[PDB]
Design a protein around this ligand. Structure first.
Ligand code: NI
Length: 341
């Protein structure tokens, strides 16, 4: 049945709640972002209003064939009225089109639902700063102190310099990057840019990227693999078998592959600096796991909450075991006592 952490009290609203059929009493279904665990259930046969960003609305229309009359896109940073309730969508610093939602309940309670986010100090100067938030529905993906990772900037720097060096030493080397969803476009776009190439990909992926309002995208991507030295493949194919096979498909244009797997966290991070990342190598194939995250580190999350000072926290991730729930509640209490709210 729809779980309680997907319902917004005192409204008729749910958030990311499309896999439970008709939710009794729901007048509006919000979708934070276009990732499958969140949209699971939508299709062309859905006949209730869906509230979302413009980018998420392009993907609903074009990839899932949801009918236009049921897509209600909202502008960011703008007070809107939905079924008599004031809402605002804020940028979540997750994947393209991903938002956080502020609800202003008629009784004066204010609720922020973060969707999936990577907390950043820039959020401390959005419309969030203008009033108090009483309840926080929080993306707790990495809510444990072992989860450290570098800035997105430092990771992209690593990747750019690695690729540029490899291709300049060997002009017959191909670069491959894995993907299974939207997000992390900076990885493959930044590499293509330094190498003076477009990124080549399947028609299904090209279609997905054309929904995203990326500036000058027609200048950066293509479906012509032959003219490109940066290829995107499904993440599943990012292994020695998958890449040897792909290399055979290129017809002796290339004699070496350098491949990137943007993973979230991997326990090499407890010890290893970004400077000290090494690849797995077999033959003329090398694979780099790089820690490009679009979720909050533990410290980033803690800082955001200690700034926001909410009265109640409701986790939305890692809620399925008692030991996870109990651990998170402990961190919440630590943060609250250290900061004094
Ligand atoms: Ni997500």
């Amino acid at each position: 049945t729809c779980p309680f952490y997907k319902k917004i009290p005192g409204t008729g609203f749910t958030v990311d709640a499309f896999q439970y059929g008709v939710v009794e009493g729901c007048t509006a279904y919000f979708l934070t972002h276009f990732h499958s665990d969140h949209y699971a259930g939508l299709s062309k046969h859905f006949t209730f209003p869906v509230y979302c960003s413009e980018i998420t609305g392009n993907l609903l229309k074009n990839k899932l064939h949801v009918q236009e009359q049921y897509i209600h896109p909202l502008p960011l940073d703008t007070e809107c009225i939905v079924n008599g309730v004031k809402v605002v969508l804020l940028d979540a610093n997750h994947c393209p089109g991903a938002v956080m939602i502020l609800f202003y309940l008629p009784n004066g309670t204010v609720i922020l639902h973060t969707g999936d986010f990577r907390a950043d100090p820039s959020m401390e100067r959005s419309l969030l700063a203008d009033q108090k938030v009483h309840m926080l529905y929080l993306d707790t993906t990495y809510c444990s102190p072992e989860y450290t990772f570098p800035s997105q900037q430092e990771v992209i720097r690593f990747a750019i310099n690695t690729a540029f060096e490899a291709v300049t030493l060997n002009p017959h080397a191909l670069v491959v990057c894995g993907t299974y969803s939207i997000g992390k476009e900076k990885v493959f776009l930044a590499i293509a840019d330094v190498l003076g190439s477009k990124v080549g990909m399947s028609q299904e992926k090209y279609k997905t990227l054309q929904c995203l309002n990326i500036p000058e995208i027609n200048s950066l991507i293509t479906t012509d693999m032959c003219s490109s030295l940066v290829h995107l493949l499904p993440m599943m194919q990012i292994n020695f078998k998958g890449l040897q096979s792909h290399l055979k498909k290129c017809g002796g244009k290339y004699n070496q592959i350098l491949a990137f797997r943007p993973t979230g966290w991997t326990h090499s991070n407890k010890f290893t600096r970004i400077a000290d990342v090494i690849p797995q190598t077999k033959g003329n194939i090398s694979i780099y796991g790089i820690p490009y995250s679009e979720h909050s580190s533990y410290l980033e999350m803690k800082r955001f909450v200690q700034w926001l000072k909410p009265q109640k926290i409701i986790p939305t991730v890692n809620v399925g075991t008692w030991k996870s729930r109990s651990t998170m509640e402990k961190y919440f209490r630590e943060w609250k006592l250290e900061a004094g709210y």
